[PDB]
Subunit: 360 residues, 4 copies
């Protein structure tokens, strides 16, 4: 597997696992990274939905940032500064739960620019992202204000860029050649939207969560990498959750997007590479799902789990697995009252030795 | 290692690892599990500050619920209804940033009763727990309201218990013979507490975060298990973060408790078992931080890391590691317009085959 | 998942993962753990072929103990005294490589009984398991002998039970209502076999390695669990190894059972549950190997990986993943080879130890 | 931590982890991977003792290669044909046990060259390395002869270079500016030796296993990277294994090198970077072992675990963790034993295979 090693001291070229930080990115390359691939419940194996896009121009975007995902992203050896721009498909906890870890993380890590979040609005004001993020920052006021004694604020504020969720394929973004176009989803209630990044002959479709809609097959068409929701079987639902045979069925026909329906949809889209996510990829579950997609779609497919990579070049769409550090490191008025400051225990004696050495 | 097997087919007694869900709790026993141990930065090896505490009476608490920790908490195979009661040592994102995941996740899981959150105030309204939770709830108002349509809204409530943070070893919880006292800590700004849980002759202190203070050594005294802040050395702060000498020195005095500071307090508390946490537990870090302590403290110590489980009985406080599933499962007006509902693609065909087959 | 938790302080019943040590085995129960599911080449994620079998009568068996398999076998919290019977499907390193780890290992851990090894004959004396095991024990004579000074030599023996590789589903082991049958495979050269375990009306079959043969479909028939080679797709053979098209083809027809061949074999046998192993279980191999079998076989299947476990009861063959300590420990259940030339090289370490030596002696 | 990123599309320099295959080794640089730090029992967390060296010249050695070390070694993305030369400290299974996965593996991992194995003699022929390997090849006879049939058997040769164990720092290897010297060790029985690697004024000592001996401290002097046995405290011997204090107390004074002896030795040696191994590095064990070193040694210290790497440059000795593939694949470098009683067993699967064969061949 991977390229042929030439010299004993020489670097293995075209490695068959992706080491984040180790590889140059082509001007005519994209590098996508599943930093989140599972849904409702948490699990070391699968963070909540989160993707890292890396364009050869230098522009990098996080599309969804759910609970768990921050751990994987931080393993990518990418400084805080470069990951400022965030794109949410809906306001489910497991799509932007970990914005605050980023928000707070990056600020302590030395991020200089404020996070820019694009999201869908709601049917009313309190159902949108402008509201959601506005209340987040209020929620974490005790964090914000304390930190904003010792660190310049600006990297604390969040420039939100809300749009109309109802809008069919309209332009939500356009800088440095990169375009994002959002369109609606039929999931839980009004607001949820699917994205389509377009840049340098390349098209990448983020499906977020949706029961099958007529806006995906249309605006997806002829994409390098197309990601869409693709769910457990109605059998597996009964097994795991103890569901009965009417709820189990409907969940795959009404509320969510089946495998067998995920297939038909991509068959319509004809992407360079289709990507099925948002299911617990386990030894007892993953297979039956793959046999669904196959019924009605026979093109290049990735059954997504955490830290799966796509290198979109001209010639090919190559899937690999990232192998990244678990012991990950970041890479490069007073909120005290005199009632708290007058408590400081004397440790001047306990610490005199190490200090002395440290100061000589 | 562990108990002596007494039959081929029988269970291994006093096993050398803790297998979550596999062991009965005794009546005069306490299980504390570290589900978070690792400062603000994200990494799979170490979730943010989170502890699960099981008492023999049948009560169970969570003390801090920082980003990531829900992946460790959920692996303990505990029905979400038993984990309703949550004590917050403060409102850093790395202490309560995964309550949201608990809130939403646990409600899909099947929590029937609301979440109960014990936290401090600030030195004004918009710096305390009552304010952060109500603004966290409004933050996720789309998630709340969409789910409410299809699941009774009762569990989606959070009952907030603001305590006064100023208070100096004063009761904040007294139910079923279990008594939580708080006291202030010196960290970021006014607000952060430590917790003393008392029950059936046991005492378990949760430090949280604190520069050395005159209250912890007094109020934690003789604790069966004593958890305190322990930072990484002022060389280590230069090595990893590129920090200057002047700053790195300061950090292990003003901002955080040194391993040496940590040693003094533990000398002055003389607990049955000490625990250092909050430092990154690595090959290249752990040994100088462990030594830092040994300058002053000599008795029993754990160097904390995710899924360390303490067993507190009359005779011993025994250290082990929990071995738990990464592929974890849970254990037992509309917000749609007719503009979105119209959008449904037709997949009666593609789903026909499996649909007919499942129904018999 | 699993069973409903009925008390706060009590035990989770029927847990969805298998914690080894943690479950009692009922008398009509069979537990099978995959301790090695991997190809010829080493990898942490997958040990070479190994299987641990637990029958509810108290009897246990390892079928194959290939390279890297002991790390998984040790993780099951079974005392060495309980794992002394080892069956080999052939003498590929990838199938008995770690025999010498269990032998030397267990003898430290404190095993009292010799190891017992059933293995095929060859066409001739020096292609069989008696010859193999004789010359392993010669290969590791410095360990056998040095260890024998300090530890009783009895358990450092290995009684070999060589059977006839040519024999068509004949008994190789009959003991305490347990039967092992062997039949031939078509693999590397003459030697290799499959096994059928017959106990309490249960039939577990360990296929080993073999190009599709006429013996497996016949004898395995109606197995409770039937374990069979399931190779990686010729396409993947090109991609991964840069194999020229026409060679890759030959491998999936001639030298190893392809997924469709496995799919055909398992329709004929009609097992309660069918296991594919041998192949590298990756995010970019497993699925088309599943596709392959599903073309030809429709009933209950597992796609093997390390620490996969089957419990066989009258009512079910349930598949879980085991969750097992990486930081594993052993669970408890003649003249000197020194000359004074080497003994006169010791260092005086009375000073530096004094402090821990004083304290520890109180 | 590590070097600064100064480009968005760029390679991040001086990374705080080591990504095997990803780093260019310099002329004035040695790279030392622990491919195995473990004890006599199996655990996934720690293979039995093994080491890989890669020298700035291009030369690459394995020092010891114990059971379950081949996973970690395969994870390094080094072609098999670059890991030809093997040195054994002793004939403990936990030190050479995975020479047979190297031999069978490497062959199918692209080794065209035969194995060179340097090991020590014992008190007699049957206790040397010549004999061990002789009989190892004889163990896997079935493996050899089937494998070789239609192939060149060259890389199937293990050339053993056996030296005297009682020879005091006498050269056992001199090739392309690399020197290996050996002295004895006190351990089990006359035979175990400890190597020193010399090259470009670099000294890298490979202890092996030994109770404190007078030799190591002399010949390991001014080491760049001095590796040595370090045992668990006599406490951790009573806790886990249930030893009486007497035996527990003695284990650490008589048989094995105590944390305090380890430190007494490295103070005598004065190495640029010492390396304790050969203990189960666990959350309840590692701390009482560091301390017992620190008693009598204050130099740069590594507490060894599987996949730790040391970069030996002119300016420093930098310790790191290797981040590597669990899904390991080999990387490409630059009379038949069948009777017709077995080849007459081949099943018809021409139907089943028809669909995929047609697709693949077009
Ligand atoms: Zn959703
Ligand atoms: Zn804090
Ligand atoms: Zn074979
Ligand atoms: Zn040894």
């Amino acid at each position: 597997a991977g390229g042929k090693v030439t010299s004993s001291t020489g670097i293995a070229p075209k490695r068959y696992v992706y080491y984040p930080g180790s590889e140059e990115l082509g001007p005519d390359e994209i590098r996508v990274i599943a930093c989140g691939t599972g849904m409702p419940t948490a699990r070391r194996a699968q963070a909540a939905a989160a993707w890292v896009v890396e364009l050869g121009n230098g522009d990098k975007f996080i599309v969804d940032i759910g609970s768990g995902s921050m751990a994987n992203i931080q393993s990518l050896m990418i400084p805080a500064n470069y990951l400022t721009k965030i794109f949410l498909t809906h306001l489910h906890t497991d799509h932007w739960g970990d914005l605050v870890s980023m928000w707070a993380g990056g600020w302590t890590a030395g991020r200089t620019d404020p996070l820019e979040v694009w999201g869908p609005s709601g049917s009313r004001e309190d159902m949108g992202t402008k509201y959601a993020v506005e209340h987040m920052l209020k929620a974490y006021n005790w964090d914000y204000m304390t930190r904003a004694v010792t660190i310049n604020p600006r990297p604390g504020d969040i420039n939100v860029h809300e749009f109309d969720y109802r809008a069919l394929n309209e332009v939500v973004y356009q800088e440095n050649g990169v375009t994002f176009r959002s369109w609606p989803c039929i999931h839980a209630g009004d607001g949820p939207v699917s994205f389509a990044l377009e840049w340098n002959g390349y098209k990448v479709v983020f499906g977020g969560d949706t029961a099958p809609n007529i806006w995906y097959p249309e605006y997806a068409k002829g994409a390098d990498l197309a990601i869409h929701e693709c769910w457990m079987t109605s059998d597996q639902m009964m097994t795991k959750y103890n569901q009965p045979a009417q709820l189990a069925l409907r969940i795959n026909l009404d509320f969510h997007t089946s495998a067998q329906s995920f297939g038909q949809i991509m068959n319509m889209v004809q992407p360079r590479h289709a990507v099925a996510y948002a299911f617990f990829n386990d030894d007892d579950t993953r297979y039956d799902i793959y046999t669904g997609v196959r019924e009605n779609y026979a093109g290049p497919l990735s059954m997504a789990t955490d830290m799966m990579v796509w290198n979109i070049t001209r010639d090919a769409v190559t899937e690999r697995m990232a192998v990244s550090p678990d012991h990950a490191w970041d890479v490069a008025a007073s909120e005290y009252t005199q009632y708290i400051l007058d408590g400081r225990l004397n440790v001047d004696e306990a610490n005199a030795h190490w200090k002395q050495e440290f100061m000589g």
